[PDB]
Amino acid sequence: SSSDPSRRTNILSDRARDLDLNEIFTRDEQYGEYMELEQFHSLWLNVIKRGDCSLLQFLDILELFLDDEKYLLTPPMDRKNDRYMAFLLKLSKYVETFFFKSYALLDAAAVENLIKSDFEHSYCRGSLRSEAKGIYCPFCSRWFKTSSVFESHLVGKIHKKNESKRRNFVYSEYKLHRYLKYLNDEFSRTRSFVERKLAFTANERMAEMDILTQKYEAPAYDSTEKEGAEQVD
Amino acid sequence: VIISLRNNHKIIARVKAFDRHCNMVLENVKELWTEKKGKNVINRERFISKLFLRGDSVIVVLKTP
Amino acid sequence: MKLVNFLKKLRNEQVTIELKNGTTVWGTLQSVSPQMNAILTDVKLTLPSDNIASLQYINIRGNTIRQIILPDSLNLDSLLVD
Amino acid sequence: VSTPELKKYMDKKILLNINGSRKVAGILRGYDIFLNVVLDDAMEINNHQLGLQTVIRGNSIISLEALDA
Amino acid sequence: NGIPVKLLNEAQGHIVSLELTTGATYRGKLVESEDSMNVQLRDVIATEPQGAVTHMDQIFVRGSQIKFIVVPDLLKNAPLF
Amino acid sequence: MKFTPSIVIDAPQYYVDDLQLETESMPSSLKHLTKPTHILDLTNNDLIMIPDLSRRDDIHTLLLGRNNIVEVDVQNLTLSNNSIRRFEDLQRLRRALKNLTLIGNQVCHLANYREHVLRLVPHLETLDFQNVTAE
Amino acid sequence: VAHSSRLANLIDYKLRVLTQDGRVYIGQLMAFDKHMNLVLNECIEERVPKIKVEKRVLGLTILRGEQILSTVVEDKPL
Amino acid sequence: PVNPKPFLKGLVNHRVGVKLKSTEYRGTLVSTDNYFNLQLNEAEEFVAGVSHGTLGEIFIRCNNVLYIRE
Amino acid sequence: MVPPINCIFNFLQQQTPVTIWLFEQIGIRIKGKIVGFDEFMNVVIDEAVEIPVNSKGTPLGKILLKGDNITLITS
Amino acid sequence: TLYVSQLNEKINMQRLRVNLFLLFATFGEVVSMNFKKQRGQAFITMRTIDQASLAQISLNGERFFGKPLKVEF
RNA sequence: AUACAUUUUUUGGCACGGACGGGAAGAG
RNA sequence: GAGACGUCGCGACCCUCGGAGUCGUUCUUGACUUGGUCGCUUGAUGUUUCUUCUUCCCGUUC
Ligand SMILES: [Zn+2]
Structure with missing residues (x-):
């Protein structure tokens, strides 16, 4: 653990010091939380040759x-x-x-x-x-x-x-x-996300996007994490 | 409604927004053009869900009842 | 009234953009000017039958941008409110 | 806002290089803030004059290179 | 007001280079410049887009049709910036 | 003192007298320079083999003075004061190169060293700071 | 490169620049405009004939925004 | 005496044809503005003097216009 | 000095043979008599005649040619 | 800075400077005109002083483009 | 201490064993 | 692949030959000035008109 920084900055070992998740997961996937299907909704519209199909109807x-x-x-x-x-x-x-x-x-x-x-x-x-x-x-x-x-x-x-x-x-x-x-579970989780964002306002959707973004561009280990704070049972 | 455009793009789409410049927010978007080599005859068109449009592009808009 | 306002309101959106010279541009709109000058991040330039070229930051000019292809999910009526 | 200072070129023959790889000649008679040019008539560059006097629009001018020094 | 405009103005006197939309580079002493880059130049050479060069006296150019202007590198010193 | 990503990131970077990076036993991890340099100065190091480079499209000048180059795995290559001993070891340079310097290498004293380089690496125009001539 | 909001905040960065004619101007942005005209410190016009990059060093250049298509960041400061 | 704008105004609810920056048009004029954008009914598309198609109800953008004619 | 507007006015007053050139269009010209005047270069020109340029004559009616695509005037 | 003279003045200025840079890079991180006055000469500037001294002693009389260069502080 | 589109910028005049490369020779 | 028209280079019988600098006033600033020619014995490069095959060698890919 922590083989990269001077003392305690990066959880990644020297073995995998150049390992980066953001090069594997997009921001809309949130490291496996959701799967981004909007793109496929686009391609789908292109496939059905119309627009009668909504994101939610596509998920359906x-x-x-x-x-x-x-x-x-x-x-x-x-x-x-x-x-x-x-x-x-x-x-x-x-x-x-x-x-x-x-x-x-x-x-x-x-x-x-x-x-x-x-x-x-x-x-x-x-x-x-x-x-x-x-x-x-x-x-x-x-x-x-x-x-x-x-x-x-x-x-x-x-x-x-x-x-x-x-x-x-x-x-x-x-x-x-x-x-x-x-x-x-991921399919359901995302469909849920869709409905939520959809029922947001402008400010709401904006702040939510802010959150997804922050989660995306944040260190995997914070300088303010706990080590050895174990409870019993 | 259908829109003619400077770059030979027949934009068949549902209008959402409108302004002084004739910029448009578009839903149910279906463009029509032709990617061709010389002496090549192909007719192509793609669906897009939501699409903003710039006004200098617009030549003539039309409404088919 | 103004589409400029609407554009401004559209923030942090991962979008495709289409130019007067036909270049397809996949990027996250960090900001847009009052005169439609798009400022993108995490950008990906592709032509309309040839290989791709990716870039971190691109400030594209307003006169060039023919059509900004919007995101998948978007509440338009709400956006259109003053 | 400011006037194009072409008072040096007043009443002199000028090559008005104009849009679409074309040319015009003629003596300078007047102009405005948009850089429209009013000039005594001369030829279009072998050669053939049209008109007695001529007016060139501002947008159309590439250059107005002085024939006389 | 535009700082590039200011720079251009400053460059007055100096030997600026100057290409247009046509792609016809000029080089010469910058006689006068305006807010709209309506440049005048003296003792000016004129390259054709294809290659050939032609000397000429006092060229005027309208900024609309100007593409880019090269100014001498002494002006980088001051005093606008 | 491995040539590492961290090493490259704190290294003096400047515009030389081209964009040059100021820099070890083994050449490695060049990926981290991100192909942003026209020149890389590897003088006074302990490299044994000119090898291990990623695809670097920018890189036009390599200054490799006072190292221990004994084998070879780009317009200018300066190899002064290294360890190339056999004419055949210079063969890999045929696949590159206009400015080449191999002075102060044992290989220099081999019979016909100059003519050998000229025939096997004809793309070189200046060899050891002397013009390759027609004769 | 950093994650800027505007062009003005990234002053003096080495800039790739595209123009309608297809040329590529590279150099440090000294000064911006209301109409996106750019002053470039050490400007190099790089053009591609219909093959491989042709190259011309210009110097200090005022560049008109009409002709400007888009700007990209080539490197950091200094 | 006759300026352009008044002529244009007069020519509302009447046949007009428009050339572009090129293809000819032919239709009855509905209305006009200061910017010289057009709105026509019974639009016929004269592709260099060849009525290719009859669109009907159309709106022409000003900057692409070349000239107006009866 | 003789401004352009003034010149235009004079032409209008006269009613003389005007020969207009088209912006970014070499092959075609117009020939008629100036009737109108605008704040911009736009005018109405009755009895106009389209001309193919010498690298004949063609039928044309009354026309307003738009100010942006004008190039030359003479009257 | 070292002052070099006795250089073959037939080499074009940009080539001279680039070979000078190459040759002298071996001693540490590194002005030449063709006027009548300055032709056949060059000033080579190094970040480190020890580099200048080493260069001076090791390349004194080095054959460069045909002539033996003369170096001095 | 008490902010907006009609000539100079952003409403644009835009668009239509098999390949490969280099070098040399010989033929039309 | 060939003909212009230009623009920057390999050799030489040739030619040619040796930001900086000064001053006023004051402890630091304001003013004023500033390779060319011939070959290529198959050097490199745009515009602009017209009309490939076979063999051998060296490199990439499968
Ligand atoms: Zn079966």
């Missing part, structure tokens, strides 16, 4: 991806749309990097492999089942009566084509799904 859209089936059976747009798939890619990437960024201590490779194996062993194996329509396929966006026709459809030229073209997108969608699930 994102919520779909917390569900195991909604993002699949009640899609914002047609899942074969280009603009849409591209957007989804960018967003997915963002959510994932944010996830591992905000939880350094957890083995990233472990998580990655876990998700990948879940994708191969369950997701692409008729993990989505309905008592009425049968088995849904992420790649062909169709259901199937029984598991039998489902299996003999996974060798057909159609499914070969699709699984061979839309593989990366399907996988990215899935990642967006599971990573957003793992970050439910």
Whole structure:
């Protein structure tokens, strides 16, 4: 501890003396408190080719991806749309990097492999089942009566084509799904933030911004911190 | 409403503010132009949520009912 | 009445700005003059098909700035009050 | 606010270098605070005179370089 | 009032250099300057944007069409600043 | 006395007689200069190898007098009074350079040292303060 | 560079400067204006022909604000 | 005797055409001001003497104007 | 001295062949008779004629040419 | 400051000064005109005095651009 | 001690094994 | 890649040859003055008109 300064100024060790969080987190993320989705709301407006969509309605859209089936059976747009798939890619990437960024201590490779194996062993194996329509396929966006026709459809030229073209997108969608699930608390936290700031006045919003800023450009250890003030129990 | 502009930008947008200079605060913004190489024909347009605009740019504003 | 006032009120906003020469400028508006001279911090200059150039502080002139692309979340009516 | 001190150039022939890589000649007859020029007529630079007297707008003047010393 | 204007005024007498919007550099003794940088100059050379140079007597220039003015480095000393 | 970020930050900085930084066993951590210098003065130090530089687009002059340079990993390079001993050790300079000085290095007394430098580093115009001539 | 409010407060800092023609003037801001005209202490015009940076040292320069596009900080004082 | 501003005033609720800094226009004049900004109805866009489109209700900015004509 | 305003007034009084040049536009000129006068260079000029410049003649009606895009006058 | 004379006056002024700077930088952190009076001469100024003395003793008669330079305080 | 847009500034006349580089030779 | 038109350099048979400085008044200030020519034997650079292939060598990238 404190290997950088003369005595006690910087908690960082000499080992990682040039380690800076602000080069990893933006100010609107507040070191993992929130995730900045305004940018993606912009890109989204660009994707839907209109303006009927508000920041909050956009977040309402994102919520779909917390569900195991909604993002699949009640899609914002047609899942074969280009603009849409591209957007989804960018967003997915963002959510994932944010996830591992905000939880350094957890083995990233472990998580990655876990998700990948879940994708191969369950997701692409008729993990989505309905008592009425049968088995849904992420790649062909169709259901199937029984598991039998489902299996003999996974060798057909159609499914070969699709699984061979839309593989990366399907996988990215899935990642967006599971990573957003793992970050439910952050998603909620941010949505809350949005509603708050939104219900502010001018002066209020300004002072709040001031606060986020100060938190952003402040030393991680203050010259006025405690060392050895332990209570008991 | 639609706005013609000095730099060949057809700004289809919802007006919010107005002044002496014909500067405008804009919502629901949809610009229209054409990024082209020589002998290239492309028609491009992008959505923007909120956008301030400067007045020298404005040539002719118009209202399509 | 005045958009200048509105501009002034917009403080500490991370915004894109567009010029008469088409340069896209991603930065935090620390201040703006009465004559629209934008003063940015944490600035990022990109052209409209080529590589990016980042800078700490940029004072852009009022005559150049075609369109300031505003933030995502913003209460406009409130801002417009005197 | 202040008047352009062109009283030295009064009643002398001047090359009015004007907007768009063009030129004008002619003897200086008058001017104002906006730097509009009133001058006896001469040619546009091979060469051809138009007008008896001429008035050049202020904005248009790049330069007014003296032909006579 | 503008300190650059003041500086320009001070530079009166001295050999200033002077480029325009056109990109046609001049060098000469600064005869007179005004609030609007309406410069007059004596004994003045005149470079074309392409390259070629032409001597000329008493050029006038209107500050609107002026781009930038180089003043001699002695004026850095005083007395305006 | 490692060449450190902290070291560079308290180092005399001035406009020389170009922007120059006044400066060690190993050249390292130059990132912290932020590519803001035209010249860097490393004279009278103990550097062994001219290596370890970050990408520095500004840097045009390197004064490396009285060090222990014995190997080489930019318009002017002054290496006076160092330890380059073999003509082949000067080979890496072919990849750079108009002003080169290698005086007071053992390599200087090697047969054909001047002609070797001229053919292998033709971009040099002034070598050891003498004009490289056509002949 | 520091986190200033205005241009006036950062007087005498070494400044990059862009102008409408595409040239880049670099030098210390000695004095500002109501119309953003700049006095530069040791001014160097740096231009780029349609390749690589062409360079010209000017000296003490009064620079008109009409032609000025934007200013950037090149270095600290002194 | 006839100045410009009064002429302009007179020409309200009447056909006018405008050139720019270039494309010709054609429409009925609604109103005008001191700055010479325009507001027209039944605007037709004469692209060098070719009516490309009929916009209808428009507002022309003053500084881009070249001349007015019937 | 003969001011510009005075000159303009004189021209108006006369009603003479005026040939106007356009600012930042070489190829075109105007030719008519001055009818109006303004505080700025703007005027109304009835019986105007657009001219393509010699590097003929074209039809044109009554016009006010705006003061900012004027260059030359002669009358 | 050291005064150098007996310098090859054919070198252009800016090149002379830059080689002078380079050569003398080896002794410590470091005026030359081509007038008739001052040609073939230069004044080299060092921050440290010990640097000036070392330079003087070590470069006395050093061949520079073909001629042996003469140095003095 | 008791503050604002109509000519000189900021309402603008703007816009339309495979590459790469250097140097040399030989041909059109 | 070639023709102008300029502007700053490698060599030389050539030419040429040796902020500072002064004063009034007072313990510190106010005034006044101030490389050129020829080659390149394939030096570097803008404007401005017209109309590439193959082979060998040296460096970056995959
Ligand atoms: Zn399928």
